[PDB]
Amino acid sequence: NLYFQGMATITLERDGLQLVGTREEPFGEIYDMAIIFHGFTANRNTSLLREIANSLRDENIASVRFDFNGHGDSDGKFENMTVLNEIEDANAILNYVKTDPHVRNIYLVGHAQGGVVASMLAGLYPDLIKKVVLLAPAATLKGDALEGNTQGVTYNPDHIPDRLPFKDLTLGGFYLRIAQQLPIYEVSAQFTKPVCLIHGTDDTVVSPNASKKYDQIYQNSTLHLIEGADHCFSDSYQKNAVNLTTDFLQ
Amino acid sequence: NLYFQGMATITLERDGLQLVGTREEPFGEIYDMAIIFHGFTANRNTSLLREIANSLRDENIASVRFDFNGHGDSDGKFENMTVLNEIEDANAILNYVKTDPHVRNIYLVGHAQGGVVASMLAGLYPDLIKKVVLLAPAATLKGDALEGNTQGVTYNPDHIPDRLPFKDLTLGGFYLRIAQQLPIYEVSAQFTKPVCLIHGTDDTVVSPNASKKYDQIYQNSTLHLIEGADHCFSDSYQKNAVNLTTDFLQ
Ligand SMILES: CCOC(=O)/C=C/c1ccc(O)c(OC)c1
Ligand SMILES: CCOC(=O)/C=C/c1ccc(O)c(OC)c1
Ligand SMILES: [Cl-]
Ligand SMILES: [Cl-]
Ligand SMILES: [Cl-]
Ligand SMILES: [Cl-]
Ligand SMILES: [Cl-]
Ligand SMILES: [Cl-]
Ligand SMILES: [Cl-]
Ligand SMILES: [Cl-]
Ligand SMILES: [Cl-]
Ligand SMILES: [Cl-]
Ligand SMILES: [Cl-]
Ligand SMILES: [Cl-]
Ligand SMILES: [Cl-]
Ligand SMILES: [Cl-]
Ligand SMILES: [Cl-]
Ligand SMILES: [Cl-]
Ligand SMILES: [Cl-]
Ligand SMILES: [Cl-]
Ligand SMILES: [Cl-]
Ligand SMILES: [Cl-]
Ligand SMILES: [Cl-]
Ligand SMILES: [Cl-]
Ligand SMILES: [Cl-]
Ligand SMILES: [Cl-]
Ligand SMILES: [Cl-]
Ligand SMILES: [Cl-]
Ligand SMILES: [Cl-]
Ligand SMILES: [Cl-]
Ligand SMILES: [Cl-]
Ligand SMILES: [Cl-]
Ligand SMILES: [Cl-]
Ligand SMILES: [Cl-]
Ligand SMILES: [Cl-]
Ligand SMILES: [Cl-]
Ligand SMILES: [Cl-]
Ligand SMILES: [Cl-]
Ligand SMILES: [Cl-]
Ligand code: NA
Ligand code: NA
Ligand code: NA
Ligand code: NA
Ligand code: NA
Ligand code: NA
Ligand code: NA
Ligand code: NA
Ligand code: NA
Ligand code: NA
Ligand code: NA
Ligand code: NA
Ligand code: NA
Ligand code: NA
Ligand code: NA
Ligand code: NA
Ligand code: NA
Ligand code: NA
Ligand code: NA
Ligand code: NA
Ligand code: NA
Ligand code: NA
Ligand code: NA
Ligand code: NA
Ligand code: NA
Ligand code: NA
Ligand code: NA
Ligand code: NA
Ligand code: NA
Ligand code: NA
Ligand code: NA
Ligand code: NA
Ligand code: NA
Ligand code: NA
Ligand code: NA
Ligand code: NA
Ligand code: NA
Ligand code: NA
Ligand code: NA
Ligand code: NA
Ligand code: NA
Ligand code: NA
Ligand code: NA
Ligand code: NA
Ligand code: NA
Ligand code: NA
Ligand code: NA
Ligand code: NA
Ligand code: NA
Ligand code: NA
Ligand code: NA
Ligand code: NA
Ligand code: NA
Ligand code: NA
Ligand code: NA
Ligand code: NA
Ligand code: NA
Ligand code: NA
Ligand code: NA
Ligand code: NA
Ligand code: NA
Ligand code: NA
Ligand code: NA
Ligand code: NA
Ligand code: NA
Ligand code: NA
Ligand code: NA
Ligand code: NA
Ligand code: NA
Ligand code: NA
Ligand code: NA
Ligand code: NA
Ligand code: NA
Ligand code: NA
Ligand code: NA
Ligand code: NA
Ligand code: NA
Ligand code: NA
Ligand code: NA
Ligand code: NA
Ligand code: NA
Ligand code: NA
Ligand code: NA
Ligand code: NA
């Protein structure tokens, strides 16, 4: 605001869970604000999300970025997270943002699974959200769950197990049962305001076809395929994601 | 079981919320079990649900019935309940039931909004649930939310308010935004095992057309229209609901 600029820690609650977040506060009495959503197994402080927040703050766009339930510093077991309860987390964060008297326009920025959360939340609040940026939005998590193959971990899609060992973690069977029937595009398509879609051509985690499909469903979208970029826009690809996001929101 | 028959209190947790429930335990080493779901603003102990549980227990069918979040003895604010987080409550109760070593078949019985919870949960677990009974399933809550008229309380469906005073309570705007885009029939229709639909012809809360539509979408359903019955199968209508439910599950 006019008096404080910088980082602050924010905590919110959703159901019985504390959600821990970082606010970047820019200069100015009134400013726009982006809510930034991390991906599956990630956290609010990956290099990509910090550099997005930093870049927006440099153009006097505020941001908040929270750890989802089951991730980072927020409460809850990873095994109990689903895309649906992350959308509930997102709604709780939006409640916080939308009542801040400094905030003019609200934007959503989501990476990967956080892009599915962002796109679905904007479709539930198409009257309130003003712009959306999706970075490698993981809408393919649905098709993967229907196929019975989630990032190389295979199971019966017709009879999903109670829980699925997944790397060092345990993924809930309910995550997968929800994933299979998530109306990702149906809900997302209700947002008719501007959307920026950014996807790396060498993403091996989420096919760029996800973003090509969002670009088809959305009334007002712009698609950016980043030649050679991977799923996280790592290293020399990162500024492609940061620049496009910043430019779109200013 | 062979040694204890009667009532017990059960508590489960979902996210950070305690859910309080009543188990009716029948005689027998192995038995089927019904999970019974109450409606909007109701609780696990309405006369209808107690008499269902009692009648099933008399045919040695066990049951559990929990207060949803925001209701009865369970945790959470009513203002923060949605149909979606009740489905999350239902999944937590199913986790409990499906790991009980006495339970043979699992049935779902849901009244009104609890019927939407039941029908959607069965569509997420069509491999596990064996039979469903819906009593006046409130699938019209979706159409009502799209219309902007929820049990006589009117609002703009295009711009749902943050919260909606509703009788002595406060209904969350997010309940309504979720309601509008709930894929009730899409998810429910995935359950192809037997369903019993029971609806009163004089229900003024949820049109009998809801049950007529479920009867169309389901592969294996039986529809019972109870001439003169109201929304709760009150008083002299109650045994119609209790008898049909019991008969169907035995
Ligand atoms: C951390 C950033 O990346 C992620 O969010 C990717 C998520 C996503 C991809 C495909 C899947 O089948 C899936 O199922 C769990 C998840
Ligand atoms: C207690 C048993 O009855 C209920 O569950 C009925 C619920 C239902 C009916 C129509 C609605 O528009 C609605 O929106 C909140 C809720
Ligand atoms: Cl100020
Ligand atoms: Cl000043
Ligand atoms: Cl700082
Ligand atoms: Cl705080
Ligand atoms: Cl606490
Ligand atoms: Cl400005
Ligand atoms: Cl930094
Ligand atoms: Cl840092
Ligand atoms: Cl972490
Ligand atoms: Cl945690
Ligand atoms: Cl697709
Ligand atoms: Cl299994
Ligand atoms: Cl949904
Ligand atoms: Cl689809
Ligand atoms: Cl469709
Ligand atoms: Cl969207
Ligand atoms: Cl490509
Ligand atoms: Cl990853
Ligand atoms: Cl960068
Ligand atoms: Cl026993
Ligand atoms: Cl004995
Ligand atoms: Cl007793
Ligand atoms: Cl207990
Ligand atoms: Cl507690
Ligand atoms: Cl038996
Ligand atoms: Cl009693
Ligand atoms: Cl009693
Ligand atoms: Cl009560
Ligand atoms: Cl309560
Ligand atoms: Cl309908
Ligand atoms: Cl309003
Ligand atoms: Cl419909
Ligand atoms: Cl459809
Ligand atoms: Cl169903
Ligand atoms: Cl009728
Ligand atoms: Cl009522
Ligand atoms: Cl009775
Ligand atoms: Na500072
Ligand atoms: Na800070
Ligand atoms: Na603090
Ligand atoms: Na709370
Ligand atoms: Na808390
Ligand atoms: Na600043
Ligand atoms: Na200013
Ligand atoms: Na990440
Ligand atoms: Na972790
Ligand atoms: Na933690
Ligand atoms: Na925490
Ligand atoms: Na969790
Ligand atoms: Na925890
Ligand atoms: Na866990
Ligand atoms: Na403006
Ligand atoms: Na797909
Ligand atoms: Na899909
Ligand atoms: Na399929
Ligand atoms: Na498979
Ligand atoms: Na992968
Ligand atoms: Na595997
Ligand atoms: Na399954
Ligand atoms: Na497993
Ligand atoms: Na399915
Ligand atoms: Na669906
Ligand atoms: Na769903
Ligand atoms: Na979809
Ligand atoms: Na753009
Ligand atoms: Na990659
Ligand atoms: Na893949
Ligand atoms: Na395209
Ligand atoms: Na293209
Ligand atoms: Na488009
Ligand atoms: Na344009
Ligand atoms: Na393009
Ligand atoms: Na294009
Ligand atoms: Na372009
Ligand atoms: Na490029
Ligand atoms: Na490359
Ligand atoms: Na690189
Ligand atoms: Na940068
Ligand atoms: Na630069
Ligand atoms: Na007893
Ligand atoms: Na008891
Ligand atoms: Na006890
Ligand atoms: Na828990
Ligand atoms: Na608790
Ligand atoms: Na008994
Ligand atoms: Na026995
Ligand atoms: Na009731
Ligand atoms: Na109450
Ligand atoms: Na209470
Ligand atoms: Na409680
Ligand atoms: Na609640
Ligand atoms: Na409480
Ligand atoms: Na309340
Ligand atoms: Na059997
Ligand atoms: Na309707
Ligand atoms: Na409908
Ligand atoms: Na409509
Ligand atoms: Na209206
Ligand atoms: Na009414
Ligand atoms: Na009114
Ligand atoms: Na609305
Ligand atoms: Na209001
Ligand atoms: Na809509
Ligand atoms: Na939908
Ligand atoms: Na939804
Ligand atoms: Na529907
Ligand atoms: Na029947
Ligand atoms: Na009635
Ligand atoms: Na009505
Ligand atoms: Na019919
Ligand atoms: Na009929
Ligand atoms: Na049928
Ligand atoms: Na038959
Ligand atoms: Na009939
Ligand atoms: Na019929
Ligand atoms: Na009949
Ligand atoms: Na009748
Ligand atoms: Na009557
Ligand atoms: Na009567
Ligand atoms: Na009776
Ligand atoms: Na009798």
Author numbering:
A (entry chain A), B (entry chain A): -5 to 244
From the paper:
We previously showed that LJ0536, a cinnamoyl esterase purified from L. johnsonii N6.2, is active towards a variety of substrates including short acyl chain aliphatic esters and phenolic esters. The structure showed a canonical α/β fold characteristic of esterases, and the enzyme is dimeric. Two classical serine esterase motifs (GlyXSerXGly) can be recognized from the amino acid sequence, and the structure revealed that the catalytic triad of the enzyme is formed by Ser106, His225, and Asp197, while the other motif is non-functional. The structure revealed a prominent inserted α/β subdomain of 54 amino acids, from which multiple contacts to the aromatic acyl groups of the substrates are made.
The Ser106Ala-ethyl ferulate complex crystallized in two forms (Form I and Form II with a dimer and a single chain in the asymmetric units, respectively). The two ethyl ferulate crystal forms are nearly identical in structure. We focused our analysis on Form II due to better occupancy of the ligand in the active site. The electron density for the C2 atom of ethyl ferulate has missing electron density in our structure, which is consistent with this atom being part of the leaving group after hydrolysis. One oxygen atom of the carbonyl group that forms the ester interacts directly with the oxyanion hole formed by the backbone nitrogen atoms of Phe34 and Gln107, while the other oxygen interacts with His225 and an ordered water molecule present in the caffeic and ferulic acid structures (the ethoxy group of ethyl ferulate occupies the space of this water molecule). Due to these interactions, ethyl ferulate rotates slightly and positions the ester bond perpendicular to Ser106 at a distance of 2.73 Å. The ester bond is strained from planarity (bond angle of 116°), suggesting that the hydrolytic mechanism involves a tetrahedral enzyme-ester intermediate, typical of esterases. We observed a water molecule 3.3 Å from the non-carbonyl oxygen of the ester bond of ethyl ferulate towards the solvent-exposed face of the pocket. It is possible that this corresponds to the water molecule that is the target for deprotonation by His225 to hydrolyze the tetrahedral intermediate between the ligand and Ser106, regenerating the enzyme and releasing the product. The opposite end of the ligands, on the far side of the ester moiety, such as the ethoxyl group of ethyl ferulate, rests on a more solvent-exposed area of the groove and has few interactions with the protein.
